[PDB]
Amino acid sequence: EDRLQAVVLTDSYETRFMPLTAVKPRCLLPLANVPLIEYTLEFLAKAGVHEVFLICSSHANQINDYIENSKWNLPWSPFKITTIMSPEARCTGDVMRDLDNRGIITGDFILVSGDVLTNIDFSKMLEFHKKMHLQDKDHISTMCLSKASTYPKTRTIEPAAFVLDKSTSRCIYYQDLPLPSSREKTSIQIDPELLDNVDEFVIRNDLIDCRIDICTSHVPLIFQENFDYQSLRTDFVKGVISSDILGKHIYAYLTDEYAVRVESWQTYDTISQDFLGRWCYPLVLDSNIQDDQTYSYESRHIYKEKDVVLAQSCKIGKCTAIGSGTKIGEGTKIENSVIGRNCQIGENIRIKNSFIWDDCIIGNNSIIDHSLIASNATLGSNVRLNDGCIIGFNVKIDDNMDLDRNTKISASPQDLDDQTLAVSIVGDKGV
Amino acid sequence: SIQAFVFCGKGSNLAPMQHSTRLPKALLPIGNRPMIEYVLDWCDQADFKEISVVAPVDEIELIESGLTSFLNSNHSHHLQDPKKINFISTGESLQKELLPRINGDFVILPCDFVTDIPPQVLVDQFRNRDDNNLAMTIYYKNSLKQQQFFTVYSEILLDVYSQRDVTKTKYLQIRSHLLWNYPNLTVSTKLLNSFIYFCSFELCQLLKLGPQSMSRQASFKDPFTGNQQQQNPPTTIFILPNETLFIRANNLNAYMDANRFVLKIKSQTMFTKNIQIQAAIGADAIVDPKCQISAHSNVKMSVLGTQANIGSRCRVAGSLLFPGVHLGDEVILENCIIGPMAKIGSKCKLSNCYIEGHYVVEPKNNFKGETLANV
Amino acid sequence: KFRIPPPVCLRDGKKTIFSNIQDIAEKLHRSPEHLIQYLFAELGTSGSVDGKRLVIKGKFQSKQMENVLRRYILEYVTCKTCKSINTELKRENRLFFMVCKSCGSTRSVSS
Amino acid sequence: PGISSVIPTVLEQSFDNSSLISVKELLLNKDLIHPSILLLTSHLAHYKIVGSIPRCIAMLEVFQIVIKDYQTPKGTTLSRNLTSYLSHQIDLLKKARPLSVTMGNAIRWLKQEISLIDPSTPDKAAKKDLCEKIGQFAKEKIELADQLIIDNASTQIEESTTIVTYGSSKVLTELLLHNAISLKKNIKVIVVDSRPLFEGRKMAETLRNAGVNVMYALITSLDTIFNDVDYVFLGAHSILSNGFLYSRAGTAMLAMSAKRRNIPVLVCCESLKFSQRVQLDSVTFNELADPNDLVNIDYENPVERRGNKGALLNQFIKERKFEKKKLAMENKPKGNKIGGKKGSEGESKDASNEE
């Protein structure tokens, strides 16, 4: 039950964020107006940590600085942050190998890939895991899966068709399909290797990725043994099914309450929206986590920090949130959009269903629809943006532009159109 | 609009009992009572007048004779013999032949039935959802290998895949367009269809447009997949058959059922051993031989002993009887255990009073008074 | 037999898809359309020809396809008197009469 | 022949006169009775959507169907044991579900029709005309009235709206739909749900089927909402000779709240649903159902958990009952929308003696 170490895969899913992640590390980017790492840390604490470990890689100095800044740094914390520093660029097998080389591995150690923030109480889960362990020697690792709104629709990267058990809760098949977006390989398989032993076959698909694992003493040794598992989902579960290490059990925890991990950009937006609303049991910003935070709760699902001002006569839809150091002008038509920290507003702006990051000037006469504006990137006069316009680092949107739907703009100070220098591409400008 | 179909024929698929041309299958004396008694009872419960009976090429009078013999119904049954079938298929060939005479929705029941489950509630359910087809499923025994395809989905209760396995394919074969919709399917490895069918008017014109009929199970309900493209016009809710789960035992005989049924029977059931006078109020009753009983008798979960006479209006609610008892004129009972020699009656509504040995009941009131032996 | 290529294919649902079919066509020396025709003859499937990986409707198993392939290799092509490899397509009245290039003998295949 | 017996749960102490109990599961009835009516009654009994508007229409339709099917006897005339049959049907209906004001009106109309064409006419001549007449009546007194109401509603909004809503009534839903679509205004809809039979959820579903900006709440959750919001609406079932609102469940509290927060409510009325019967209390005559209406816990309707509660007769020394139809305050709702566009509830019986 007690004494459990935390190991979290950081600096791993870079470039999966299609424009971002190159100069500053993946996790250091400001999520919901305040750093992503903190939420994850809090979650870990809630679960039950005794020492914090992250597998940092991309530019370690900044990570070190962050650690220095952080609250877990000085004596008062039950757990300190001392990140594992390794050679540059390596996969999850390689990461595991590195960890093994380093040495600090325990019995019931915790392994979470990427960054996650959800509500479900973990103590019960832990207890269940322990019980399972107490049953037989062959039990391995824990899966986290949650139910969704009947039919799948906003799921293409990970629409896993889980064939599952009710009596023992154990996986039978795993498949990722591009069927809702590109109808080319519509395929479902039922393997016969565990067919005439289970009998209670349940065919399901409507479940969401969390990538949170409680790992026993078997896992790192297994990793060390088999160099074919460079990944952890598509190869691993299949291998387990196939009985590479013969006759072993895996758990599939099924919860009625909502649980999703961080993956893409629309998904990120959805997560943010959820956080803003009361979709997960207690999660709030107004409670204040990181030192200098001065957040306060308001009615009509509205979040306001201190040093926050919005002016009179703004007839609005529903749900708005503002960061600190913000001055908002007069006469605006707004529906379900979010404005970040130290963002300035002149006059006359229409906004619908949006999220805005750190220090982004919403210029005079501008429309933001389902589109993001990132750190130091600013909007000037007469910009007409549409649904899903992704903006990265230092995109200085200056004078007169019209960008179409689903357009992606490059970040780091290359592969995709529209660049960092003055005005985004409508009339060719750059180097 | 209201009509019932009764199917009755001959069996040859079974291993044993059947050899001569004189004895078919309609008049089987396995254990005193005939096979069709249950069916008759069901019909009585249903209450119907215009019921059509069907027969194949062989035996034209013997079945009629059987129907006549022993006999309550006293209605008007009608039987027809169209001669085109040569035993290859059960009633599809008959259905194809007779179509404009059908008034509306119809209830189909074959001769091979043993029932213990509630009756008209299937019919009512059918009426309710207002769909094309309905069938039921029954579990396998717990007392002393893979069998056949059965899948369920409910939130409402419906059927997705029904195609049987005799020439069984190694992998489980279905459709993914029938999986993308309904994303919480379950494969069952216990179920068995027991020849219960309920159908509607709309499927009477499609048989003449396109003949597809196979064995009344291979194709009778199979067109349900309405996905991808579709290249057939609909006749004027999606065209889907339904499946409903049950608990109590109501099995079928087709491959391996002849010895187990007898065991199930004799050990429980509706008991008859002596002369009876018989619509009646009180479900599930246990009656003994040598006695003489009258009408309007009320029994609520009660087992009698050797010789127990009931005369002129009685209401019994949880009472057990032991050797030799007399009952005459007006008895109402609530929670009693009775011993030897008892003459209970004298008009009373007694609750929580036990009767001991050698006593005649007087018309008097006594609260918490245990019926003691002698004063 | 060594000439049979190892098929690495799992039971892909909804529509029967084969990527190793081209290799089979190549090594055993036969037109891809013939295989499609054979498939059609076997089972009521509807699909269009795609030029290497085929798109044919039907959720069918990996072992039954294997069996079919084996059958094709055996009693559909080859010869009883000689176990020869190279067999080529020639048409002599309307139905197919396959010929072997090692010697020169005619055989009638329809069932 | 037919027998009642066996009643579920405790009978409490108060409200002990109204017929509400018995024949839920079918077990032996009368012989030559047409079963469509029975089926309809059963449907009505196990219904969770119906509210004021459609039931009567459905009944009318059923009657029409019956008439179309009706066979005139080979010896006797069109009405001899027909009346007896009708009486039996009525009794069955009563046993199943109480006959409301609308139902009474329908019965009256039927009687009038009977009086009009009395024992003299053959088969396919009388009923041919009667059916058509009925159809015409249906076309006239109902659909057109509804249309009129809709049109009244259309004009009733001038400049800007923010609304809180409640009710199963179809007319309100229709109005909302109209607001959403063929008016293109700056409409806002906040939904209130009720526990016994679900209406709010249905309303929400309907809104979704259009794609509207929708807030959602319940009976108790009211106070925090009003922290800009103006309009409030309700839907009534029937109004008596007295002028008091003899309608369904959670309306009155909402109305009171609205009054307190200083912007009143408007309810919609029908130019047929008025009764000779006189009542001013809950005890006289009320819609009463089995206590199974308050069993389900959290989120949805079909879940069933074995956690805290799951017994009624076993719950010794306990008196569990609930009300469906309420008698709302007279002075509280301001506007009423009938066939004559607009007017106060000071009308009461200004259509009753009009006949």
Sequence-ordered list of residues with C-beta below 8 angstroms from that of D136, at least 6 positions apart, any chain: none
In angstroms, the CA B183 to CA A164 distance is 13
CATH class assigned to A5-276: alpha beta
Of B171, B180, B186, the CB nearest to A190: B171
Examine the domain organization and report whether D304 and D178 are in the same domain.
yes
Q: Give alpha helix (H) positions in chain C.
A: 21-27, 32-42, 62-71
**Nearest chain D Cα distance for residue A164, angstroms:** 21
Experiment type:
cryo-EM
Please report the sign of the dihedral spanned by the C-alpha atoms of residue D20, residue D25, residue D30, residue D31.
positive
Measured between alpha carbons, how far apart are the two ends of chain C, in Å? 24
Strands A212-215 and A109-113: antiparallel
D50 touches D34 (CB < 8 A): no
Q: Which residue has the tokens 């003489």?
A: B292
B contacts of C61 (beta carbons < 8 Å): 169-171, 173
- Domain-embedded: residue D2: no
Provide the residue range defining the domain that includes D96.
11-148
Quick check: C64 and B170 CB within 8 A?
Answer: yes
The 3-state DSSP class for residue A308 equals strand
Find residue D214's DSSP bridge partners: D189
* Closest to D175 (Cα-Cα) out of D250, D267, D265, D238: D267
* Closest to B297 (Cα-Cα) out of B309, B339, D7: B309
Tokens coding B62: 């013997």
How big is the B-C interface in CB pairs under 8 Å?
20
Q: Using CB atoms within 10 A of its CB, is residue D277 exposed (0-12), middle (13-18) or buried (19+)?
A: middle
Supply angle C-alpha A285, A291, A295, rounded to 5.
30
B166 touches B209 (CB < 8 A): no
Interface of C with A (CB under 8 A): 10-15, 17, 59
A340 touches A361 (CB < 8 A): no
Sequence-ordered list of residues with C-beta below 8 angstroms from that of B280, at least 6 positions apart, any chain: B295, B297
Out of D106, D130, D148, a domain closes at: D148
- Domain-embedded: residue D4: no
- Residue D152: its H or E element: helix D144-155
B contacts of D25 (beta carbons < 8 Å): 121
In angstroms, the CA D179 to CA D186 distance is 9
Measured between alpha carbons, how far apart are the two ends of chain B, in Å? 69
Residue A240's Cα: distance from chain center in Å?
Answer: 27
Instruction: Kindly report the backbone phi and psi dihedral angles of residue A350, in degrees, each rounded to the nearest multiple of 5, phi listed first.
Output: -100, 125
**Nearest chain A Cα distance for residue B184, angstroms:** 5
How big is the A-D interface in CB pairs under 8 Å?
6
Examine the domain organization and report whether D250 and D215 are in the same domain.
yes
Residue D60: C-alpha distances to residues A111, A285, D8, D38, D64 (Å): 67, 58, 32, 15, 6
In angstroms, the CA B89 to CA B7 distance is 12
Examine the domain organization and report whether D346 and D222 are in the same domain.
yes
- This PDB structure is determined at a resolution in Å of 4.6
For chain B, domain boundaries: 1-269
**Nearest chain C Cα distance for residue A188, angstroms:** 4
**Nearest chain B Cα distance for residue D196, angstroms:** 21
Examine the domain organization and report whether D205 and D349 are in the same domain.
yes
A238 touches A162 (CB < 8 A): no
Closest Cα in chain A to C14: A187
Strands A396-402 and B78-80: unpaired
Strands A163-164 and A109-113: unpaired
Q: Using CB atoms within 10 A of its CB, is residue A314 exposed (0-12), middle (13-18) or buried (19+)?
A: middle
Residue A405's Cα: distance from chain center in Å?
Answer: 24
Closest Cα in chain A to C10: A189
B90 touches B7 (CB < 8 A): yes
* Closest to D174 (Cα-Cα) out of D52, D327, D60, D345: D52
D319 touches D130 (CB < 8 A): no
- Domain-embedded: residue D160: yes
Quick check: A189 and C15 CB within 8 A?
Answer: no
* Closest to A242 (Cα-Cα) out of C19, C10, B173, C59: C10
Tokens coding B143: 């007392």
Find residue B332's DSSP bridge partners: B315, B349
In angstroms, the CA B99 to CA A221 distance is 72
- Domain-embedded: residue D89: yes
User: In this complex, is the C-beta atom of D308 within 8 Å of any C-beta atom belonging to chain A?
Assistant: no
A189 touches C12 (CB < 8 A): yes
Quick check: A185 and C17 CB within 8 A?
Answer: yes
Q: Side chain identity at B200, as an amino acid letter?
A: S
